[PDB]
Amino acid sequence: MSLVYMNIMMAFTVSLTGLLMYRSHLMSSLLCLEGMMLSLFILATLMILNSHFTLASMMPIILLVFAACEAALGLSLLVMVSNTYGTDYVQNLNLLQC
Amino acid sequence: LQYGPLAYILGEKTTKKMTENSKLITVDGNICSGKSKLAKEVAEKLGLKHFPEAGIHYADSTTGDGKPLPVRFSGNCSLEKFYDDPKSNDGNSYRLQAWLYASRLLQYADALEHLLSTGQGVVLERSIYSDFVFLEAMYRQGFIRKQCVDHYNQVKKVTVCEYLPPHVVIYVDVPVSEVQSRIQKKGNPHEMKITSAYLQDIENVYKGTFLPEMSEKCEVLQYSAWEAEDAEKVVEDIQYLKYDKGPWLDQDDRKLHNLRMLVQDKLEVLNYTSIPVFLPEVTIGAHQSDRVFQEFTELPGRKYRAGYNEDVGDKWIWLK
Amino acid sequence: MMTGRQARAPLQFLPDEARSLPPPKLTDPRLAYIGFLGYCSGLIDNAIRRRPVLSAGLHRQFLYITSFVFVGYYLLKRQDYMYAVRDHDMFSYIKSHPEDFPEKDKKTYREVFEEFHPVR
Amino acid sequence: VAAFLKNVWAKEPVLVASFAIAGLAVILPTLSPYTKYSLMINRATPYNYPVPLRDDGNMPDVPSHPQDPQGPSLEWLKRL
Amino acid sequence: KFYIQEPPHGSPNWLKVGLTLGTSAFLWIYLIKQHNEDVLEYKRRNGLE
Amino acid sequence: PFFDVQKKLGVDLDHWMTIQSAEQPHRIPARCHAFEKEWIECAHGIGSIRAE
Amino acid sequence: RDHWIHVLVPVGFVFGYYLDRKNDEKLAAFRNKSLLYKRELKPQEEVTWK
Amino acid sequence: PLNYLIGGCAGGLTLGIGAAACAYMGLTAALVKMGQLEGWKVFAEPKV
Amino acid sequence: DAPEKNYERTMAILQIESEKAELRLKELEVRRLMRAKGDGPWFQYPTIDKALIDHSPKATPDN
Amino acid sequence: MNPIILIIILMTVMLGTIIVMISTHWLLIWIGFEMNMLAIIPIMMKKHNPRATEASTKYFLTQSTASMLLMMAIIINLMFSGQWTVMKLFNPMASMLMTMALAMKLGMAPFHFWVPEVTQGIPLSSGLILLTWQKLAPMSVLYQILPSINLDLILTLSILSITIGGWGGLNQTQLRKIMAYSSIAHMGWMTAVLLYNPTMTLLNLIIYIIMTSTMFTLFMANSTTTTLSLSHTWNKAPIMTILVLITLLSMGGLPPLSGFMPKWMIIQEMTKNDSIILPTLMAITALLNLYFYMRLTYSTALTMFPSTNNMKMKWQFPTTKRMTLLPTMTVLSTMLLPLTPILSILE
C-alpha cells in the first residue's frame, strides 16, 4: 500500500514490540501503549483528511478522549501498585501464580 | 435480610443513630477478677446493653429455644475437663479454646450488630481481641502444641482484620494471690485445679502483649482490685475521655454499611473459623460428623429454617 | 444462517406471519415438561433454604410453575415459527431452482445390481 | 425555601451565583423571542452555491433573477 | 412462643404472598386469553371454522 | 447478537458517520462520493456473497 | 385413602397404557390401506383397528 | 501407510518413552498418509 | 395388539421417518447451494443501506 | 463501595456491552469496549487487596492491547474500504487483527495467559461477571464479521484453546482457576462452530453462561474458593453438595445433561461440513476436561470428606445469602436436553 501510512504502521508495530517485551517498569508498558494510541490517532487523521470525509473528523478526537481517559485509568492502577510495593516493578506483580 | 443495600438507599444511615453514648466497651481481667459484676454495673449506669461472657453454649443461647444444647452438638469440649486434665490426650485444650474463639466471634458480631442497628452501646466481657492471652498462656504451660498456635493465628489473621477495636478497654489488676483467694473461696471443685504459673502467664500476656498493642488502637482504662469496686469512678473515667485514636473516627455511612452487612450474615462471620487446616484436636472424621449432624437434624426446631418447624408449633407454613 | 430473513424486520419475537401458524396446545408435552421444570425449581428452592420441600411456599411453587409455563409457551411459539420459516424457505428455493434439484429416476431392484457378499 | 436561600447567600455566594447563572442560561433561551432569529440567520448564511433549477414550466415560487419579487428575502435582517 | 429470637419468616409476608398469587393468576389468565386469541387468529387466517 | 435497535425504534444513532455519501455538513463531498455511491447502489440488498 | 401411595405405579401404568392408545390414532395413516390387510368394511364397523 | 508407520517409529526411536513414541508417531504419520490418500480435511472449508 | 394394527402402524412410522430423511437430505443440499451461490433467503450478510446516501446538490459539482 | 455507585457502574458495564451489541459503526464498537473495561475495573477492586490490584493491572494491560489492535483493524478497514459499517472486513490483514483482538478480549489461547490469574485475584461475583457478561460483546462482533474471519486462524485458536483449557485443569485446587480454564476450553468450543453455524455459537454461549452462573452462584452460596474448602459442603448444607456436582457434570459435557447439548450440536454442524477429524480431537480433549473435573467430583461427593469442630456452630445458622436464580439456573443447566430443538429461537 502507501508509504507514509506504512511508516505510521511501522511505528505502531515498533511500539507494539516495545509493549510486548517488558524490561522493568509498568510505566514503560503504559508509554508503549500510549505510543500505540498516538500512532492510531496519526493514521486515522491522515486517512480522514485524505478522503475529505468530513463527519469523521470528530472521530480522532473521540479516539483521543476515551483512550486518554483509558490512560488515566492505567495510571491509577500503577499508583496503587506503587502504593503496595514502593516501586512499579512488574516482577512484584506475580502473586497470582497460585 | 431485613437490612440490606436497599435500606441504605432508602435512608437508613447508621451514623444517624451514632451518638456519644454509642460505645463498645470491653471489660478485661483475670479468671476471678470480679469484673462480671462491674460490667453489669456499667450497664446500669451508662445505659448500655450488657453481653455476658461467651461460654460453651453462646450460640445455643442465641438460636433455637435459647437453651444450651447437649455437648456433642455444641463444642464437643468441656471447660471442667480442661480444669481436670489440661494435658489430656484427645486435645480438649485447643478444641475448647477454638470453640470459645468462635463463640466470642459470634458475641462480637452480635455486639456490633446491636450497636449499628440500634445506636445503643454494648459492654462485652473478654472480647476476641483478648482471647489469645489464654491461648499463649496455655502454650506456655505445654497444654497445647505449636501447630495449635499456628492454627489459631491463621484463624485470627483471617477473621479479626475485618472488624474495629472497642472504644474502651477496661482492664482490672488483680494479682495471682487474690485470684487464687477468690478461686478457693468460689467453691467450684474443678476450677480450683488451676495452677499458679498458668494464672501468672495469663497476667503476663495481659500486661506485656495485650495492653501495649491495644494502647495504640484504642484507649484503655486500668484499675486495681478495690478501685474497680466503685462503678461511678469508672463511669466518670469513661465519660470524661477524649476519643482521639482508633479507626472509629474515619467511619462514614459506607464503611459502617459494609460492616453492618458483614456482621448480620452469621455464616460469613463464622466462615473462616472452620478453615480446612487439618489439626488433630479439631479434625472430626466423616462418620462422626455424619452421625452428629443427623442427630442434630432431629432436635426439636432444628429440622428446617426457624419459621418452618411443625414439631415446635409453626403455623402458616404452606403459605411461607 | 437465516439472519437475512430477520433483517428487514428486526427484534420481532413473534412476527405477524407467525399468527398464520397453529399455536401449541395447553396440553403440549413440551409445555408440561417446562411446567415440570418449574416444579423442580420450586422443590430445589425449598430445599436449598431448608424449608419443608413439598409443604412450604405453595404460592412460590405455583409461581415457579406458572412463570416457566408462561415463558415456555412463547418459546414454543417462536420455535414452531422458526422451523416453519426454515421449511418455507427450503420449499421456495426448491421450487425456484428445478435445475439444481432434478427428479431422480427411481429404479426398481430388478434393474439395480448389488454385489452379493457371502457370509460364511 | 427563602430563609435557606438567605443562608446560602450568606455562607456561599459563589455557588449561589453559579447556580443562578446556570439556571438562567438554561431557561432564558426558551423564554426569549429573539431565539428564532438565531436559527433564521444561521440557515440564511450562504456557505455553498445556490444551485439553480431547470425550469420545467410550472414553478411560481422560484424566481428567474435575484432582483425578482418571489424568493426568500432578508428584509427582516436588514431592518430588525 | 418457641424461639429466643424472632425469625424473619415466623409470619407469612402477606404483601409478598398476595403479589405472588396475583401475579401468577394474572399470568394464567393472560396466557389463556393469549391462547384463545391465537386460536381465533389461526382459524381466521386459515379458515378452519 | 446484532440487536438492531436503531431500525426497530427508528432512531439514527450512528448511521450518519458510517459512509462518506451520507448527509455531510454544508453539503461537502468526499473525494470518492460517486464511486462509493455506485458501490453502495450496486451492492444494495443482494447480500454480501452476491455483492462480492 | 389409607394406602394412596400404592396407586402411583398401577394408575401410572394405565395412563401410560392410555397414551399408547392415544398415539395409535396418530399412526393411523395406513389403516385399511396396506396391500396385505385391506378389505371391505363389515356392517356396524367404521375402522378396522382402533 | 505401513512405510510411514515405519517412519513414525523411526522418528520415535530418535525421540527418547521409546515404544510409546514409536506407536504414537507411527499412528500419526499413518493418519497423515491416509489423509493424503482419502483426502481428509483437518481445516475443512465451510460448505453447507 | 393385532398384526393388522402393528403392520399398518409400522407403515405409517416408516412413511413419517422416510419423509423426514428425504427432507434432511434436501436441507443439507439447500444449505450447500445457498451458501455457495448466495441467492437464497439464507446467508444474506448485510451490505450498506442505500437509504443513507445524500442526493442533494453538493458544494463542488464533480462527484 | 457506595451502592448507588455500584448500580451506576453495573449499568455502565451493561451499557457498554449493549453499545457493542446494537451499533452499526466501528467507532461505537470501540467506545462500547472502552466503556465496558472502564466500568468493570472497580468491580474487580471491590475488596481493595493487592491481588485485586494485580488482577486489574493484568486485565487492563491485556484489554487495552486488544482495544488498540481492534482500532488498528478498524483503521485498516477504513483504508481499504473508506467506510464504517459493522459488516465483513475488506482486508485479511484487518480481519486477522480483529480476530486476534477479539481472541484477546475473550482470553482464547495463546492469549489465555491472563484468564486464570485475574479470575484468581478478584471475588466470585466479579469473576462471574468476567466469565459470563464479558464474553457477550466480542462474540457479538465475531457474529457480525464472520464473512471475513479466516478459517484456518479461527480453527487454530479454537483447538489450541480447547487443548490448553484442557491441560490447565490438572494442577489446580483453586475453583476460580478451574472455572477460568473451563472458560478457555468453552471459548474454543464456541469459535469452533462459528464459521459453520453461529446459531450453535449462541447456543453454546447461553448454555455456558447458565452453567457458569450456576457454579459461581453455588460458590457464593457456600463462600468456598478452593477444592479443599469445597470439600466441607457435605456437613454444612447437604443439598448444596450435589447441585455443584451435577452442574459440573453438565459443564464437562455429559449426557443426559444439557451441557452435552452444545458440543454434540457443534459436532452435528461439523460432520455436515466434512470435518470428521477436528470435532473428534476437540471432544477427546473435552473428555480430558471430564477426566480432571470428574476427579474434582470424586473429591467433593466422595473420599476427601473430613470436617472440623467449628462446623458444628454453622449448623445453628441458615444461609441468609441471596441465592438469586440458583434453583432456576440449576434446573436450566441440567434438564434442558429434552428441549434441545429450542435452539431455533437463536437464529
Ligand SMILES: CCCCCCCCCCCCCCCCCC(=O)OC[C@H](COP(=O)(O)OCCN)OC(=O)CCCCCCCCCCCCCCCCC
Ligand atoms: C439547573 C441549572 C443547572 C445546574 C447545574 C450547573 C451548575 C453550575 C455550577 C456547578 C457547581 C458544581 C459543584 C456544586 C456542588 C454543590 C454541593 C456543595 O457544594 O455542597 C456543600 C456546600 C456547603 O459548603 P461547605 O461544605 O462548607 O464548603 C466547603 C468550603 N467551606 O453546600 C452549599 O453551599 C449548597 C449548594 C447547593 C445549593 C445552592 C442553591 C443555589 C440557588 C440559586 C438560585 C436558584 C437557581 C435555580 C436552579 C436551582 C439550583 C439549586
Ligand SMILES: CCCCCCCCCCCCCCCCCC(=O)OC[C@H](COP(=O)(O)OCCN)OC(=O)CCCCCCCCCCCCCCCCC
Ligand atoms: C441471545 C442471548 C443474549 C444474552 C442473554 C442474557 C445473558 C445474561 C448474562 C448474565 C451475566 C450475569 C453476571 C452476574 C450479574 C451481574 C451483577 C452481579 O454480579 O450481581 C450479583 C450480585 C452482587 O452482589 P454482591 O454483594 O457484590 O455479592 C458478592 C458478595 N458481597 O449478587 C450476588 O452475588 C448474589 C448471588 C447470586 C447472583 C446470581 C446472578 C445470576 C445472573 C445470570 C442468570 C443466568 C443468565 C440469564 C438467563 C439465561 C440467558 C443466557
Ligand SMILES: Nc1ncnc2c1ncn2[C@@H]1O[C@H](COP(=O)(O)O)[C@@H](O)[C@H]1O
Ligand atoms: N484458657 C482458659 N482457661 C480457663 N478458662 C477460660 C480460658 N479461656 C477462657 N476461659 C473462660 O473464662 C471464664 C472465667 O471467667 P469468670 O466467668 O469471671 O470466672 C471461664 O469460666 C471460661 O469460660
